[PDB]
Design a protein around this ligand. Structure first.
Ligand SMILES: CS(=O)(=O)c1ccc(-c2cnc(NCc3ccco3)n3cnnc23)cc1
Lengths: 29, 359
């Protein structure tokens, strides 16, 4: 379905950003 | 849905002016404290979320110009030093990059001939800042080299003030919207745009020549019948709203049309669903999503906080228990979820901040 596939795209793409964020060590405020 | 939240705290900012923006710092590392920024009047205030609903004031920034009215803020980090940064802007049309650790202004950008409604940082490149203005245009800046990369407007640009914009997940494109009732797609993964972005990183003191992007890659005025004050991507789909007391989910072109194959001439548009709510038909009321785009939140002009579960296909069945507190009566301008979705902050027209922890 339109939903099922759009949700997987979100999953795959937010995972890419999550993996990039995990690599970072941004200094606390 | 099953998502439940408890209101664990609230406070009021002593300036008593409306709070127009709220953003959690999604750049903080796992385990570091949860920090958010609030903007309203000529103020930028930082807070830390601690145990037992504690909202600990960290610092305040006061713009020297008492007539400045910040409408938006956005978080980034310095790609060289891993140091956090905050962009703020509003009424004056000046972008201010503040050091959140010292709460001091690092630098500013003048250029928009009117007020700034939205600031968004590229999801991959933390130096690419996108501003949206009442001047009818969107501007893309490189905050590392202090260059204006592109100005999106002109011949087929917005006809009236631009209200909101959003980058897709991987930052290949921008969808903007405004008073002209239109929603315009602007691809930034085009060879022209990628090169302009490359050229801005090479710039070092003749000044930098910004690309003038007169033409979008899609334009529609057929989703809403009035202003479009908020737009965000939902995967390849779009979530946008007007005064119709609904957030509409749609896509450019016909049902089967792939977002990356649509032509700038594309006449069609497919509405897929709707998120209905009430008492939110006034202008400048923004909706938000959590990082994983599982949750959708919008506040209304009467202090109610609507929350939807995006993993539920039916946009009616998706509705979660609306969040209310008998002392929260002012207009909820904007909400922000913490990166792990465990906290939801709402800011109001009466300078109040509300904290909703997930159960
Ligand atoms: C105190 S009042 O008179 O009720 C009042 C009420 C609302 C606003 C106001 C709030 N936010 C933005 N921009 C952000 C934005 C763009 C799209 C959504 O959100 N603005 C721009 N121009 N005015 C505003 C100002 C005054």
């Amino acid at each position: 379905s339109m939903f099922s596939s759009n949700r997987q795209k979100i999953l795959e793409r937010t995972e890419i950003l999550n993996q990039e964020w995990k690599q970072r060590r941004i200094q606390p405020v | 849905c099953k998502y439940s939240f408890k209101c664990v705290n609230s406070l009021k900012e002593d300036h008593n002016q409306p709070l127009f923006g709220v953003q959690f710092n999604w750049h903080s590392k796992e385990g570091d404290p949860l920090v958010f920024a609030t903007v309203g009047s000529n103020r930028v205030t930082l807070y830390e979320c601690h145990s037992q609903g504690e909202i600990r004031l960290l610092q305040s920034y006061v713009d020297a110009d008492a007539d400045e009215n910040f409408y938006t803020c956005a978080w980034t980090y310095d790609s060289n030093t891993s140091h956090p940064l905050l962009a703020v802007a509003g009424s004056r049309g000046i972008i201010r990059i503040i050091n959140p650790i010292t709460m001091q202004c690092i630098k500013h950008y003048v250029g928009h001939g009117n007020a700034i409604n939205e600031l968004k940082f590229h999801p991959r490149d933390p130096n690419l800042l996108l501003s949206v203005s009442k001047d009818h245009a969107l501007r893309l800046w490189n905050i590392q080299t202090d260059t204006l990369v592109a100005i999106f407007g002109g011949v087929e640009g917005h006809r009236d003030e631009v209200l909101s914009a959003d980058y897709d997940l991987l930052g290949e494109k921008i969808m903007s919207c405004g008073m002209d009732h239109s929603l315009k797609l602007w691809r930034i993964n085009s060879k022209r745009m990628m090169n302009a972005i490359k050229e801005s990183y090479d710039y070092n003191p003749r000044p930098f020549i910004s690309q003038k992007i007169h033409f979008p890659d899609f334009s529609t005025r057929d989703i809403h019948r009035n202003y479009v004050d908020c737009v965000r991507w939902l995967g390849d789909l779009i979530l946008s709203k007007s005064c119709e007391n609904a957030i509409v989910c749609w896509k450019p072109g016909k049902m089967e049309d792939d977002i990356d194959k649509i032509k700038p001439s594309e006449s069609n548009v497919t509405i897929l669903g709707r998120f209905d709510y009430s008492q939110c038909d006034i202008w400048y009321m923004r909706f938000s999503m959590d990082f994983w785009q599982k949750m959708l939140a919008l506040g209304n002009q009467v202090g109610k906080l609507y929350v939807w579960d995006l993993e539920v296909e039916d946009p009616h069945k998706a509705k979660c228990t609306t969040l209310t507190h008998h002392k929260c009566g002012a207009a909820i301008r904007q909400t922000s979820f913490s990166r792990d979705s465990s906290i939801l902050i709402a800011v109001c027209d009466d300078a109040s901040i509300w904290r909703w922890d997930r159960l």
